Amino acid sequence: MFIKPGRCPKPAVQEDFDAARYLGVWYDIQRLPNKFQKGECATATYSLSPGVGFSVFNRARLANGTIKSVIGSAIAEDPCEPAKLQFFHENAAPVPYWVLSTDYDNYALVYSCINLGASHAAYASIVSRQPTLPEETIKKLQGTMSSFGVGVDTLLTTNQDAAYCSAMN
Amino acid sequence: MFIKPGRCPKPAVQEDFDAARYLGVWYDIQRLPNKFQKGECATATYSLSPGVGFSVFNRARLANGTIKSVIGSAIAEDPCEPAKLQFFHENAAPVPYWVLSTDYDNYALVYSCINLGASHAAYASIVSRQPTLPEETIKKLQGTMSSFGVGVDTLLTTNQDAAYCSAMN
Amino acid sequence: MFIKPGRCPKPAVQEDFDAARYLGVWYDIQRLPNKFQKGECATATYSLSPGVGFSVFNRARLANGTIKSVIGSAIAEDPCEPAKLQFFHENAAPVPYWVLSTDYDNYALVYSCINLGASHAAYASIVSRQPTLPEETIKKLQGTMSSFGVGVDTLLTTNQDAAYCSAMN
Amino acid sequence: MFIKPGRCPKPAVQEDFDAARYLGVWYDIQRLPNKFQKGECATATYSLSPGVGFSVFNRARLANGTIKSVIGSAIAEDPCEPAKLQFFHENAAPVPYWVLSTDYDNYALVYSCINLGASHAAYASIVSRQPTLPEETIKKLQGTMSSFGVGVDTLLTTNQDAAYCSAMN
Ligand SMILES: C=CC1=C(C)/C(=C/c2[nH]c(/C=C3N=C(/C=C4\NC(=O)C(C)=C4C=C)C(C)=C\3CCC(=O)O)c(CCC(=O)O)c2C)NC1=O
Ligand SMILES: C=CC1=C(C)/C(=C/c2[nH]c(/C=C3N=C(/C=C4\NC(=O)C(C)=C4C=C)C(C)=C\3CCC(=O)O)c(CCC(=O)O)c2C)NC1=O
Ligand SMILES: C=CC1=C(C)/C(=C/c2[nH]c(/C=C3N=C(/C=C4\NC(=O)C(C)=C4C=C)C(C)=C\3CCC(=O)O)c(CCC(=O)O)c2C)NC1=O
Numbered sequence: 288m289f290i291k292p293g294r295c296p297k298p299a300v301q302e303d304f305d306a307a308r309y310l311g312v313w314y315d316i317q318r319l320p321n322k323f324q325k326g327e328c329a330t331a332t333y334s335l336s337p338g339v340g341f342s343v344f345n346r347a348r349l350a351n352g353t354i355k356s357v358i359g360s361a362i363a364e365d366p367c368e369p370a371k372l373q374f375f376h377e378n379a380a381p382v383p384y385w386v387l388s389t390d391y392d393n394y395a396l397v398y399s400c401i402n403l404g405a406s407h408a409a410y411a412s413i414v415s416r417q418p419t420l421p422e423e424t425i426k427k428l429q430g431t432m433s434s435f436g437v438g439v440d441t442l443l444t445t446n447q448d449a450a451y452c453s454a455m456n
Numbered sequence: 457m458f459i460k461p462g463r464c465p466k467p468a469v470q471e472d473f474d475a476a477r478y479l480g481v482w483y484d485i486q487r488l489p490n491k492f493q494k495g496e497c498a499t500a501t502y503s504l505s506p507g508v509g510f511s512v513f514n515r516a517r518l519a520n521g522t523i524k525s526v527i528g529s530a531i532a533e534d535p536c537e538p539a540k541l542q543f544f545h546e547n548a549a550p551v552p553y554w555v556l557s558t559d560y561d562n563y564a565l566v567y568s569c570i571n572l573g574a575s576h577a578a579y580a581s582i583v584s585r586q587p588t589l590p591e592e593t594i595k596k597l598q599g600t601m602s603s604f605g606v607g608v609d610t611l612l613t614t615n616q617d618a619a620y621c622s623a624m625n
Numbered sequence: 626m627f628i629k630p631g632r633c634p635k636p637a638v639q640e641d642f643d644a645a646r647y648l649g650v651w652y653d654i655q656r657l658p659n660k661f662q663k664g665e666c667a668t669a670t671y672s673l674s675p676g677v678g679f680s681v682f683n684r685a686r687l688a689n690g691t692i693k694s695v696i697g698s699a700i701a702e703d704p705c706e707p708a709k710l711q712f713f714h715e716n717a718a719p720v721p722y723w724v725l726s727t728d729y730d731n732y733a734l735v736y737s738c739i740n741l742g743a744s745h746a747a748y749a750s751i752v753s754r755q756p757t758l759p760e761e762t763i764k765k766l767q768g769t770m771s772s773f774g775v776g777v778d779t780l781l782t783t784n785q786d787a788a789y790c791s792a793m794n
Numbered sequence: 795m796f797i798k799p800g801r802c803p804k805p806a807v808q809e810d811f812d813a814a815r816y817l818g819v820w821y822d823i824q825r826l827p828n829k830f831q832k833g834e835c836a837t838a839t840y841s842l843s844p845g846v847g848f849s850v851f852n853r854a855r856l857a858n859g860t861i862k863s864v865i866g867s868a869i870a871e872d873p874c875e876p877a878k879l880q881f882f883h884e885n886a887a888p889v890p891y892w893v894l895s896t897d898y899d900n901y902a903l904v905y906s907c908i909n910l911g912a913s914h915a916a917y918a919s920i921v922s923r924q925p926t927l928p929e930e931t932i933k934k935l936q937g938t939m940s941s942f943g944v945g946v947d948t949l950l951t952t953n954q955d956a957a958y959c960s961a962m963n
């Protein structure tokens with residue numbers, strides 16, 4: 288995660304967030320540097336749960352070409368704030384997952400922040416329904432991140448090159 | 457939930473709890489009074505989840521013969537404490553669910569407590585793999601409940617009459 | 626605490642809340658029924674703390690003329706939300722304390738809610754800098770309470786009779 | 795804080811922890827590397843609170859000779875676990891503080907852990923009533939830390955040199 292001074296901000300989340308339209312495959316496009324990051328080509332696949340919330344299956348391509356995957360469950364602990372989710376990954380403690388912005392069909396902006404006293408740890412990701420996203424959409428989502436203090440200059444562009452990422456197919 | 461003096465106790469939970477063996481159908485036998493309890497003939501069905509934890513489907517027979525059902529998800533937030541679950545029901549805030557004692561094939565004793573300052577609210581339930589449970593097992597589980605301050609003569613016996621409950625089939 | 630259907634509401638809190646001006650003595654005027662309420666003539670005294678937040682000293686007149694007192698600490702866990710405090714009483718688990726409305730020199734409306742699955746438990750109190758408060762102010766604060774579902778005809782009027790309460794002096 | 799893979803461990807805390815005997819001045823002797831650490835010569839001063847818990851005043855000597863200090867409040871949220879404290883520092887989010895071991899008159903071992911998904915952030919400190927502690931006591935407290943996975947090889951010895959730390963007097 289990205290660690291820096293200050294307490295977690297509380298940005299606005301997506302209004303009338305509809306988890307049913309958020310299901311399916313998302314590609315990782317851009318994100319904060321992540322000390323724990325294993326790989327490239329990252330996707331998140333969200334699916335139906337017979338309980339509440341939805342199920343999570345994330346996949347990434349390690350430098351050696353091995354695919355690393357993790358399974359999880361996503362639940363909105365407050366049903367009146369359906370965009371403020373808790374993610375329960377196998378063998379992980381619970382972490383927050385906030386959908387700050389999505390149009391369901393093209394893009395989403397996700398934020399996770401955990402307080403560490405007078406510092407905090409964050410994930411922040413731009414994702415896409417495709418392995419790329421238009422520069423115009425990226426710049427708008429970067430504008431949203433700068434409005435709660437994310438340094439857009441620090442964001443890393445994920446490797447989604449078709450040949451490099453072919454091991455994912 | 458039943459409101460009583462004192463902060464939540466912390467009873468011992470089932471050693472080496474195995475959620476796989478805990479899945480399937482449980483019948484409500486006896487429980488604490490519950491002001492918003494709907495119905496009798498109550499069952500809990502626990503099933504596989506494609507993410508973490510397991511999925512919850514509870515059913516009860518309302519007075520006019522309708523079956524009320526609720527969907528939920530159960531997750532052990534700490535995998536080293538697998539008998540201390542959080543239940544996430546549609547339309548409810550998270551509640552704890554502690555498996556105090558089970559032999560998986562006959563009985564379980566479950567407890568849930570939320571602190572209210574110097575007072576608390578609790579659920580406590582004896583459940584069975586059949587619509588009845590032997591008196592000797594009920595008595596042993598009442599003894600466990602009395603060891604952390606549950607009053608035995610508050611417990612209600614659930615109506616599990618085969619004719620009254622036949623709408624459940 | 627008073628148990629009712631529904632999950633906790635989230636009423637608006639006092640803008641620009643200034644704990645320094647909120648210190649000193651407050652008299653209980655009206656509150657929700659409270660099964661473990663001890664006494665009448667209730668006052669809350671808030672004082673400086675050498676750490677963060679402020680210190681709490683609550684007093685009430687028991688039926689046999691003894692004064693019951695409790696010590697606590699109040700901390701706003703998020704300094705950007707200074708009217709959303711946590712109160713830590715001797716012998717109690719943490720409880721929320723939200724200053725919904727105050728003019729610092731006459732009245733305050735305080736609210737505390739804890740979720741119990743699909744139901745909740747709450748405290749709600751109208752307090753005054755004097756042992757009485759004008760009817761017009763009581764009526765306005767009842768209107769605020771009714772806007773998030775408090776039933777006005779549940780509220781109890783605290784005994785603040787100068788002769789009955791004289792043991793408090 | 796020190797960040798590494800895995801979830802927070804839950805080590806045993808000091809039995810019958812008595813906050814009254816823990817009050818006064820403690821010197822920082824040894825601790826985990828701390829990405830947020832400002833200075834050397836660190837002391838913690840714990841004092842009476844008119845509310846619950848105790849008040850905190852920490853001081854350290856920066857490389858330029860300026861003294862940095864912070865104020866805080868310490869509260870045990872569960873009165874039955876008085877060694878498991880929450881520390882509320884001015885402008886910080888709440889952080890845990892566990893007294894793992896103390897004899898009140900010579901030494902204490904303190905641990906703080908916050909989960910970051912499949913990693914965690916920790917503080918771990920050996921403190922003393924004096925600017926030094928016997929090697930025998932340090933080695934015993936290091937044994938306690940190794941028993942829940944702390945790498946004693948990573949611990950840093952705090953500069954408590956009388957001449958360097960004279961700016962603290
Ligand atoms: C932004 C919020 C965000 C959260 C809450 C998050 C948490 C998170 N992601 C994980 C894995 C993972 N997370 C991803 C990918 C994603 N995960 C996503 O939330 C998204 C949007 C993607 C990208 C498409 C992958 C591929 C893994 C497994 C490999 C790895 O650990 O890097 C893990 C578990 C690590 C483990 O088991 O070792 C956590 C706790 N990651 C995030 O980026
Ligand atoms: C002891 C722990 C215990 C917990 C944590 C618990 C929680 C719990 N049970 C619920 C419903 C329900 N719970 C049950 C039944 C059960 N529920 C069970 O956990 C068990 C063991 C049974 C019985 C076999 C049923 C039938 C419903 C739906 C009907 C109703 O609302 O009463 C709800 C939601 C109510 C709503 O949406 O209005 C909560 C929060 N109930 C408990 O009894
Ligand atoms: C509305 C929020 C509200 C909160 C958070 C609250 C909590 C609260 N009040 C308590 C006691 C008490 N609380 C009060 C009085 C007050 N307490 C107040 O917060 C206010 C505004 C007054 C009144 C002026 C008194 C007199 C006691 C001690 C007597 C008693 O236990 O009833 C206790 C501890 C009980 C014990 O140790 O047994 C709690 C948890 N009370 C509330 O009314």
Ligand SMILES: C=CC1=C(C)/C(=C/c2[nH]c(/C=C3N=C(/C=C4\NC(=O)C(C)=C4C=C)C(C)=C\3CCC(=O)O)c(CCC(=O)O)c2C)NC1=O
Nearest residue numbers: 404405822831832836837838852853854883886904906917
């Ligand atoms: C081991 C638990 C432990 C906790 C919970 C802890 C938390 C903690 N210590 C802080 C400051 C501080 N903490 C210390 C010192 C100490 N603090 C102590 O808990 C102890 C035992 C000492 C040492 C004697 C000092 C001197 C500061 C202020 C200067 C600095 O930020 O380094 C801050 C606030 C930083 C700020 O306002 O910028 C936090 C959150 N530090 C810890 O070491």
